[PDB]
Symmetry: C3
Subunit: 222 residues, 3 copies
Amino acid sequence: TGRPEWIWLALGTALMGLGTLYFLVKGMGVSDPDAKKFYAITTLVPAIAFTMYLSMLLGYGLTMVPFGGEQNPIYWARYADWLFTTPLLLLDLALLVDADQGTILALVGADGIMIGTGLVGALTKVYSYRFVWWAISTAAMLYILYVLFFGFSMRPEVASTFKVLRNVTVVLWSAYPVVWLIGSEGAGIVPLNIQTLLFMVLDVSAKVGFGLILLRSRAIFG
Amino acid sequence: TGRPEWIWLALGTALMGLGTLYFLVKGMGVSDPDAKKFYAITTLVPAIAFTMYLSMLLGYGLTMVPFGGEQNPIYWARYADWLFTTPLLLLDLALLVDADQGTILALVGADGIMIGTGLVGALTKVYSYRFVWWAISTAAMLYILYVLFFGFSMRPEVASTFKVLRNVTVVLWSAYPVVWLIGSEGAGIVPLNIQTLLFMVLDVSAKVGFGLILLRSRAIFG
Amino acid sequence: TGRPEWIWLALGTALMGLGTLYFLVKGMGVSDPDAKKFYAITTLVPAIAFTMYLSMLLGYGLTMVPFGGEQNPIYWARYADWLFTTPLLLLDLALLVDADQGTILALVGADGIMIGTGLVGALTKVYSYRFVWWAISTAAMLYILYVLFFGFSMRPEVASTFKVLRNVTVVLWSAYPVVWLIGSEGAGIVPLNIQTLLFMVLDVSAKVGFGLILLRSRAIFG
Ligand SMILES: CC(C)CCCCCCCCCCCC[C@@H](C)CCCCCCCC(C)C
Ligand SMILES: CC(C)CCCCCCCCCCCC[C@@H](C)CCCCCCCC(C)C
Ligand SMILES: CC(C)CCCCCCCCCCCC[C@@H](C)CCCCCCCC(C)C
Ligand SMILES: *C\C=C(C)/C=C/C=C(C)/C=C/C1=C(C)CCCC1(C)C
Ligand SMILES: *C\C=C(C)/C=C/C=C(C)/C=C/C1=C(C)CCCC1(C)C
Ligand SMILES: *C\C=C(C)/C=C/C=C(C)/C=C/C1=C(C)CCCC1(C)C
């Protein structure tokens, strides 16, 4: 179509779709109660992203936001996607390390604030304020990464896989506030099609790649 | 009023209301921890539907959607209703069979995708796309029914009641994608008042009738 | 700014902000699994309110609602705030008394109906109907307070702290339906700036003061 970013949305849609079907088939047969939780989460996440990418592709998950005296196309559906997939993702890490519930609630709450304020920032019409919400969102992100890095005796296999996905999480999650800032959502330093491309690549990395790593570990089996 | 479907919304409102009060009174005295969960769920579900039916009756839970070059009255509040009551309903069946958490998360997630994409379909302005979302929603439904049918040793009483409500669930839930397709939401083969009538009858069946069956079983008691 | 209520929104923002940082620092070091849940909740609640107060201060968490032939400024973000903080608050009391899950689900469900119908009331354009939703919301509140008062052997310390926060909860929560009724949201007997002032004072009392009392108790430690 007329939206140059469509190809990234179509590609994103296809890969989340393919990832969902992979994990869906991959998850067949799994009877270990613990393995099943990781499979459920890891299958659900790209299943949601699939529907959210398709809504952006079809034009539903997009709105227009006035700021800078300009009409800025804001794919709100990315935030809806993140609002559900990032706590699931954290759930993966919490179950991994048998996190305390209080810590999980801390993380999921901080996460909802993270996406919620990033959405608010994305939809805020007063340009300067966009970055106040960015800053607060980023602070919630930093809290989360802090908890994950310096909070989260497990078996060596758990500790081992946790360290991998933990380092993946930091680099990956940290890229999102940077893509937003430089992208058409924030400072408009990079145009929307490039920004969509970037977020697509991070999302598929976070929602299929991350799952491929997790589900490759015996750490998910009790 | 001027909306011919009002009587079905008024009737739906009254019966969910009456059902809530019934289960509320019925639930008094129940001290068994397990029985209390089934009562909580089974009381909450029509309590929510009551508020959602009343919002449709009063005109709040309704929006207008352009497609087919027509202004289509979409009772979005039915989806809000379903978004909360159908996982509760699944919760009833999961607790029944002592489902694994991973399986519950699978089900609740698939359920949210089911209602979420059905809502998206209901609000989609490009007519053809309405049915893409229908198809995806229906696929999530089929997944759920698959899990419930061929996934979900329990006591004979549990197995017995599970089989009943399971068969009820399949026929009942399966009717919804058919009513949407033929109704003014989808192909416009049946007009809105008839479609509302149909959904009211299914909702009261799913939100009061189903609860009457469940709460009639000793299966809910530990 | 031009909104006379801003100072109450700015003050509310500052105090929820200060409260969050206090509990955040206060919560450092806590390793007791149980204490951590109370800290997580009690820190998250004003963290959310902080973001919600700031959204009202900046003008994002506000919409205009036609009724009485007037344009009524409705701070929808207060309801978003409440929708998340009041179940957390109930969670605090449930964990306190080791509530049955069925009872918690009952409470959280009734709570969502409470805020959900109060939001619907706040956004309802037919003036009379505003109070039908108020009445239903209030009935859900009364249910909750009923459960908390005459439903919720614990150690004397638990029973002791529960009784305090329980009495706090009744007086505090009960003030909200009164402030809405007399405030510009309901009968317009008290103007919006006064109404905002009132809700700010209740919110800080409920979201920082209540937490200061809870976190002051050894009842939160296993
Ligand atoms: C361990 C196995 C079986 C791996 C195969 C993965 C297949 C699943 C579906 C396709 C997507 C997954 C690949 C993960 C890679 C990412 C981090 C990002 C790649 C995105 C872009 C397309 C190029 C890569 C492909 C492998 C599709
Ligand atoms: C087991 C007992 C006590 C049963 C009595 C149920 C009473 C509760 C409130 C009213 C509604 C419930 C009836 C369930 C029946 C449905 C499947 C659908 C009937 C809807 C339409 C009205 C006609 C039936 C009535 C019984 C109200
Ligand atoms: C037990 C200790 C350390 C108490 C100190 C609390 C400090 C935290 C942040 C500021 C707010 C908290 C005070 C709670 C009081 C309320 C019930 C309402 C007071 C609101 C208005 C401002 C005046 C009071 C202040 C103490 C800020
Ligand atoms: C899809 C899955 C994941 C891992 C996405 C991660 C999302 C974030 C870490 C987003 C963070 C944001 C911040 C910190 C500030 C700007 C707004 C964002 C929501 C993009
Ligand atoms: C109220 C309670 C229940 C049991 C309602 C069930 C709802 C569904 C099974 C709805 C399914 C839909 C699908 C499959 C596709 C069209 C959109 C719907 C959301 C109606
Ligand atoms: C912020 C924290 C808390 C304790 C707020 C409590 C909120 C309520 C008890 C609100 C109740 C309402 C009712 C009963 C009817 C009018 C609408 C309200 C949502 C204000």
